[PDB]
Amino acid sequence: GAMAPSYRVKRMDIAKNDEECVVNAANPRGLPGDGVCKAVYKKWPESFKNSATPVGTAKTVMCGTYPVIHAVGPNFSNYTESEGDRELAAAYREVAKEVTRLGVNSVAIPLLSTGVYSGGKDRLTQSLNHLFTAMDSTDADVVIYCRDKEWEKKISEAIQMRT
Numbered sequence: 001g002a003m004a005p006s007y008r009v010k011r012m013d014i015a016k017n018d019e020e021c022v023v024n025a026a027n028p029r030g031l032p033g034d035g036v037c038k039a040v041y042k043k044w045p046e047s048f049k050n051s052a053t054p055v056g057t058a059k060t061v062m063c064g065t066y067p068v069i070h071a072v073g074p075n076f077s078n079y080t081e082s083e084g085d086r087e088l089a090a091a092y093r094e095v096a097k098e099v100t101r102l103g104v105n106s107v108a109i110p111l112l113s114t115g116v117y118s119g120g121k122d123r124l125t126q127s128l129n130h131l132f133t134a135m136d137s138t139d140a141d142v143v144i145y146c147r148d149k150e151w152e153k154k155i156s157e158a159i160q161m162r163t
């Protein structure tokens with residue numbers, strides 16, 4: 001565990017993280033994909049051996065000794081708001097189980113279903129609150145990675161609100 005488990009946010013490519021493991025915003029088929037998934041494929045392509053896994057689940061594959069946790073959020077283009085919400089919460093609960101099982105002291109995590117799987121909606125608050133529900137009972141240092149300056153400010157504010 002971390003000495004004083006924390007949440008932080010950074011605005012940069014998750015493929016350059018400084019944590020003991022990474023969460024991929026995966027697709028169910030283990031394909032290179034786009035966005036975070038493509039950056040993860042470039043950096044850790046070995047981790048895509050038998051990484052296919054259903055929506056709402058996480059599957060870890062080692063790249064050397066570095067764990068890549070493939071977390072499959074719902075594509076809100078395909079799911080109803082209600083079913084999508086249930087699967088998005090479930091994907092994060094499976095991430096918390098994997099982070100715990102691995103015994104890591106830190107994890108780099110993107111906001112699932114906020115990019116090409118958002119169904120064109122802003123899901124910062126929805127995705128971040130499911131991340132907190134899952135990760136609050138873990139003792140790993142969590143570092144959330146984002147792209148956009150306005151998202152960094154909103155994520156930082158949500159973290160600081162609780163402290």
Ligand SMILES: O=c1cc[nH]c(=O)[nH]1
Pocket residue numbers: 025026027032033034035036037038115116117
């Ligand atoms: O390929 C995919 C699927 C989900 N999320 C991404 O970032 N890329």
Ligand SMILES: O=c1cc[nH]c(=O)[nH]1
Pocket residue numbers: 111114115146147148149151152
């Ligand atoms: O538009 C987006 C989606 C995810 N993360 C960001 O920082 N911006």
Ligand SMILES: [Cl-]
Pocket residue numbers: 011012013016
């Ligand atoms: Cl960067």
Ligand SMILES: [Cl-]
Pocket residue numbers: 025112113114115116117118
């Ligand atoms: Cl996404």
